């Protein structure tokens, strides 16, 4: 689910970056509420994740070549010899059915080599289970003597946002998913909206990412009025402040000038102490998911703990 | 001293607008703990029906099986519950799905080519190119295929796009729609937005008559501040219409001459339905759930 | 890809309002804002859903391995 940024530099269109979306526009509240978000950890909404927010897939391709000049290994199944329930994953040709679910140990292809006179299989092995997306048979590097020996198999590995996955705004504010907080337990706005992503306020005083702060009230203004805003550097001045510019836009729409929103607690249900800073920020999902050495020996000597060392 | 009969004396309800989908009602002289409880139940407890097990036979479309299955689950079905019993998860699939526990919806679409003069429209260039929610054919099975005779299973919104196809591609599936609650998956939500807003209070400390009254009137939405004349003070006509923007407080001439608060007892509820139940039915069931929750604990043995 | 079913934030069905939105921009020649209002999208969350939709599916469909040329 790729999305076009509301807040963007006009050069985004000049490079036609809409052909390749890199993120999604999310309701982000600068709040310390859950207690699981702090400095390098951020919260993702459960009901948002359940609705396909930030969902991704990962494709992996494998080349099954039979080369290791006389042809010995042949794609398919050998007669008389056939180990139990292999036909569940592979078709008559020995190649797998495109769409089939595979786990580590399952057969990914089948062949027969005359040297051993036995029907063998190339096993699929990875901690992550997959589905077959594409199977391509390639019989090249021959003029008239044609026979298949090379096959390319593409695996589709579904990747839902897991606790640990990194997420970041376009202002260098990356954080790992600390928890997928339920919407009932999530803080709810006066409007009735609960944030998709929760960023902790203690992130901003050290990083000084004020671009994100103005992005929050710009994204909100553009979502309401339905107009994209220019966030190209040096467009604004000391006299012509963006906080005043989008602040006027937020007031005109019917919201708080300083980008705040009166929010209520999901647990107690009571209105929170002060208005929470909420807006629309373009978020990006990052792709990433024993030796006892001399120093550990030294540490075990250190405690005077001779049996732990032993 | 608070009595349950003394609550009946002060408790009031005011219905502003009651549409077929959304109802705007007020709960006067009730506690926050009770008003918040109803809102929480009218978004979690309230269950519904919808696809759950999509059985694919063929899918040559661009849209992956997982994605297409998930989209069918998200499509709300104009099916009244209570007609269905709750499915049991421990017994196997052959005993699990019955005519009382499951509703079957089939989708069988094959795309072909059509001769037309050529930008050209997809409805003109190809046949069965766009797959809609209305293409989910209801198949009644078993003991009861007469109970849904005067009640055919049709999606609440039929024009929902489910898939886009090109000639040669086909979709063949059998979806098993079951009974579930919104806490498990959002695809079971019955109401769109159930929220309350406290009645805004504008405590005018000074008369602030004259041209400052016209300046004070512009700080609030049009139908909030009313002025009698140049004098006769500046009154609050309809404090309910207020957006609570605090615009009046960001002016030196009014920052100390007015106070902005609320009526803690007064709640302005706004309940919109997804389409299955009426907004009143959703609120009534919420009160019935809170009563049943307290009743279940009443007739219960206090162990240890 | 295609128009999402329901608004990510609240859950208001948005999937039936994509083709209708383009008709309000083409034939009716209205502005982006007024078009969304006539569709029944007043919350800014529901507003951005359709307004900000790309619809890459129309670009994706132009590659069809089942029909010649």
């Amino acid at each position: 689910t790729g999305q076009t940024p509301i807040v963007k530099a006009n050069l985004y269109d000049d490079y036609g970056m809409d052909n390749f979306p890199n993120g999604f526009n999310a309701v982000v509240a600068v709040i310390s509420y859950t207690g699981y978000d702090m400095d390098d950890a951020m919260i993702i909404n459960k009901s948002a994740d359940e609705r396909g927010f930030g969902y991704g897939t990962m494709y992996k391709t494998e080349k099954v070549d039979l080369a290791l000049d006389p042809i010995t290994q042949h794609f398919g199944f050998g007669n008389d010899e056939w180990p139990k329930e292999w036909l569940e994953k592979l078709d008559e040709d020995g190649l797998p059915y495109i769409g089939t679910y595979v786990e580590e140990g399952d057969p990914i292809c089948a062949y027969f080599d005359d040297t051993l006179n036995k029907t063998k299989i190339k096993t699929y092995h990875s901690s992550e289970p997959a589905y077959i997306e594409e199977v391509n048979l390639i019989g090249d590097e021959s003029n008239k003597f044609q026979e298949l020996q090379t096959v390319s198999i593409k695996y589709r590995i579904r990747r839902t946002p897991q606790i640990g996955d990194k997420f970041s705004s376009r202002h260098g504010q990356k954080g790992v998913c600390s928890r997928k907080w339920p919407t009932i337990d999530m803080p709810f706005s006066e409007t009735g909206i609960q944030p998709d992503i929760i960023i902790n306020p203690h992130a901003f005083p050290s990083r000084m990412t004020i671009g994100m702060f103005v992005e929050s009230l710009a994204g909100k203004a553009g979502a309401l009025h339905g107009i994209a805003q220019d966030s190209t550097p040096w467009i604004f001045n000391e006299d012509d402040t963006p906080a005043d510019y989008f602040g006027e836009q937020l007031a005109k729409a019917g919201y708080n000038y300083h980008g705040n929103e009166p929010m209520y607690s999901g647990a107690t249900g009571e209105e929170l102490r002060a208005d929470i800073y909420v807006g629309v920020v373009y978020y990006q999902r990052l792709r990433h998911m024993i030796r006892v050495g001399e120093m550990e020996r030294d540490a075990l000597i250190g405690h005077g703990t001779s049996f732990l060392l032993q | 001293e608070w009595n349950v009969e003394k609550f009946k004396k002060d408790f009031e309800v005011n219905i502003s607008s009651l549409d077929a989908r959304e109802a705007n009602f007020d709960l006067i002289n009730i506690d926050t703990s009770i008003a918040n409880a109803f809102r929480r139940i009218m978004i979690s407890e309230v269950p519904s029906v919808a696809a759950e097990y999509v059985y694919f036979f063929n899918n040559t479309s661009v849209i992956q099986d997982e994605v297409l299955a998930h989209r069918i689950g998200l499509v709300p079905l104009k099916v009244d519950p209570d007609m269905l019993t709750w499915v049991d998860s421990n017994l196997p699939d052959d005993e699990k799905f019955t005519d009382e526990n499951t509703i079957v919806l089939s989708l069988n679409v094959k795309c072909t080519r059509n001769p037309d003069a050529p930008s050209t429209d997809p409805k003109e260039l190809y046949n069965n190119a766009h797959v809609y929610a209305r293409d989910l054919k209801f198949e009644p099975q078993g003991r009861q295929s007469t109970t849904f005779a005067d009640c055919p299973v049709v999606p609440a919104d039929p024009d929902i796009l489910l898939a886009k196809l090109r000639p040669g591609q086909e979709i063949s599936l059998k979806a098993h729609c079951i009974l579930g609650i919104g806490g498990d998956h959002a695809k079971f939500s019955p109401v769109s937005t159930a929220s309350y807003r406290l009645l805004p209070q504008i405590n005018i400390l000074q008369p602030i008559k004259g041209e400052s009254a016209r300046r004070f009137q512009k700080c609030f939405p049009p139908g909030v501040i009313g002025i009698d004349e140049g004098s006769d003070e500046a009154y609050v006509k309809d404090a309910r219409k207020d957006t609570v923007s605090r615009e009046v407080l960001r002016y030196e001439e009014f920052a100390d001459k007015v106070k902005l608060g609320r009526v803690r007892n007064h709640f302005i509820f706004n309940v919109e339905s997804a389409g299955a139940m009426t907004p009143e039915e959703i609120f009534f069931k919420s009160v019935r759930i809170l009563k049943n929750k307290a009743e279940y604990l009443k007739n219960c043995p206090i162990t240890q | 890809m295609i128009v999402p079913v329901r608004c990510f934030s609240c859950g208001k069905v948005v999937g039936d309002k994509w083709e209708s939105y383009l008709n309000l921009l083409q034939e009716d020649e209205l502005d982006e804002g007024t078009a969304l209002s006539r569709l029944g999208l007043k919350r800014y969350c529901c507003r951005r859903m359709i307004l900000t939709h790309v619809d890459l599916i129309e670009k994706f469909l132009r590659y069809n391995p089942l029909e010649k040329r």
């Binding site: 001045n237 006299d239 919201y255 | 807003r197 049009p222 139908g223 219409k241 207020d242 302005i268 | 007043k42």
Partner: peptide, 24 residues
């Protein structure tokens, strides 16, 4: 340096629960 130019047409578009855009 020339200052940016303001926009045009910016009316209200948020009211109470049971109140529409009837008030102009």
């Amino acid at each position: 340096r020339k200052d940016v130019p303001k926009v045009e047409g910016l009316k209200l578009e948020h009211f109470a629960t049971g109140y529409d855009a009837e008030d102009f």
